[PDB]
Scaffold this motif. Structure first.
Motif, mmCIF file in Angstrom:
data_model
loop_
_atom_site.group_PDB
_atom_site.id
_atom_site.type_symbol
_atom_site.label_atom_id
_atom_site.label_comp_id
_atom_site.label_asym_id
_atom_site.label_seq_id
_atom_site.Cartn_x
_atom_site.Cartn_y
_atom_site.Cartn_z
ATOM 1 N N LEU A 289 0.827 -1.202 0.000
ATOM 2 C CA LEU A 289 0.000 0.000 0.000
ATOM 3 C C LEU A 289 0.865 1.257 0.000
ATOM 4 N N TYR A 290 0.567 2.173 -0.914
ATOM 5 C CA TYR A 290 1.317 3.420 -1.019
ATOM 6 C C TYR A 290 0.776 4.465 -0.049
ATOM 7 N N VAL A 291 1.561 4.774 0.977
ATOM 8 C CA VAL A 291 1.164 5.759 1.976
ATOM 9 C C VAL A 291 1.988 7.036 1.846
ATOM 10 N N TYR A 292 1.352 8.172 2.107
ATOM 11 C CA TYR A 292 2.025 9.463 2.017
ATOM 12 C C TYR A 292 1.656 10.352 3.201
ATOM 13 N N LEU B 51 -2.930 10.870 6.834
ATOM 14 C CA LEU B 51 -2.239 9.837 6.071
ATOM 15 C C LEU B 51 -2.993 9.512 4.786
ATOM 16 N N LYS B 52 -2.266 9.465 3.675
ATOM 17 C CA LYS B 52 -2.864 9.162 2.381
ATOM 18 C C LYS B 52 -2.399 7.801 1.872
ATOM 19 N N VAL B 53 -3.277 6.807 1.964
ATOM 20 C CA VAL B 53 -2.956 5.460 1.510
ATOM 21 C C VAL B 53 -3.606 5.165 0.163
ATOM 22 N N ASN B 54 -2.929 4.361 -0.650
ATOM 23 C CA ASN B 54 -3.441 3.999 -1.967
ATOM 24 C C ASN B 54 -2.942 2.619 -2.385
ATOM 25 N N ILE B 55 -3.648 2.000 -3.324
ATOM 26 C CA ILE B 55 -3.277 0.677 -3.813
ATOM 27 C C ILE B 55 -2.095 0.759 -4.773
ATOM 28 N N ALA B 56 -0.893 0.559 -4.243
ATOM 29 C CA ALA B 56 0.317 0.606 -5.053
ATOM 30 C C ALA B 56 0.082 -0.010 -6.428
ATOM 31 N N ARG B 57 0.653 0.609 -7.455
ATOM 32 C CA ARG B 57 0.503 0.122 -8.820
ATOM 33 C C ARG B 57 1.694 -0.742 -9.224
#
Length: 97
Positions: free
Chosen positions: A18-21, A79-85
């Motif tokens: 998971l891509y977190v920022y 926190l900004k999480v996203n489904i890593a590509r």
């Protein structure tokens, strides 16, 4: 007149990483922030891009976190999480780490 969009942006559920920022978040913080969702097997932080890659033992969590942890404000930090590509089938139990 409809205030906003009718519903939400439908999307599937799949992925391990998971891509977190963040901005003022620390590794140890994400540990107890992503743990609640599941088990963290891979957690790395990059001060440069101020991001963090949290991997869940299961794929069910991946979507979960990205659903809750997404735009969530934990420890007074958004926190900004996203489904890593580009995250294909990756080993779960690395022996020759």
């Amino acid at each position: 007149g409809s205030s906003g969009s009718s519903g939400e942006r439908r999307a599937p559920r799949k992925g391990n990483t998971l891509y977190v920022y963040g901005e003022d978040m620390t590794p140890t913080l994400l540990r107890g922030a992503f743990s609640p969702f599941g088990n963290i097997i891979d957690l790395s932080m990059d001060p440069p891009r101020n991001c963090a890659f949290v991997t869940y033992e299961k794929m069910e969590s991946a979507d979960q976190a990205v659903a809750e942890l997404n735009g969530t404000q934990v420890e007074s930090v958004q926190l900004k999480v996203n489904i890593a590509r580009k995250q294909p089938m990756l080993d779960s139990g690395p022996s020759s780490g």
